[PDB]
Amino acid sequence: VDLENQYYNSKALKEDDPKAALSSFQKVLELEGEKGEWGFKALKQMIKINFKLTNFPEMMNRYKQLLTYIRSAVTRNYSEKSINSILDYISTSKQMDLLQEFYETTLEALKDAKNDRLWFKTNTKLGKLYLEREEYGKLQKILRQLHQSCQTQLL
């Protein structure tokens, strides 16, 4: 059933250069997201190239496309590990001035009551970025959410 999508994802995975490869990953996505795990992996690679080389708003758009397979299609664990690894790559590469907005969009899309560590660790690291930003107003709202999540992590 998924025999085609696996091959097109594996074919677009090579190429080395992002030229014509991003459009091939877009073709993998265009083969409709019925599963759609392979579209998630295609976008994950598209993200992996986009913030590493040139343009950033396109990465924000494709990341917003990634934030749809959280509850449906792909499991919570694989999406959590993918988001965590991507956030670590951006944190090592670029600084707060881009990273903070991606953290904000991640928390804006994770509107789910079952998110325990998924909401917490992202809100905590955003709190650290807000501490580096010298913002204390919205940081109190972040700390209000974090304190109300309990009323290990409390410390």
Which terms summarize this structure?
mainly alpha, 8 helices, 1 chains, globular, 155 residues
Structure summary:
It is classed as signaling protein. Keywords: signaling protein, PCI complex, CSN, SGN, MPN domain. This protein starts with a helix and ends in a 7-residue tail after the last helix.
Question: How does this structure look, described?
Answer:
It is classed as signaling protein. The entry lists the keywords signaling protein, PCI complex, SGN, MPN domain. The entry is titled "Crystal structure of the COP9 signalosome". The protein is COP9 signalosome complex subunit 2. The organism is Homo sapiens. The protein is mostly helical and 155 residues long. Helix content is 68%, strand content 0%. The chain is built from eight helices and no strands. The chain has helices at residues 3-13, 21-30, 37-50, 57-66, 76-93, 96-109, 117-133, 137-148. Helix 1 (3-13) packs antiparallel against helix 2, helix 3 runs antiparallel to helix 4 and helix 7 (117-133) packs antiparallel against helix 8 (137-148).
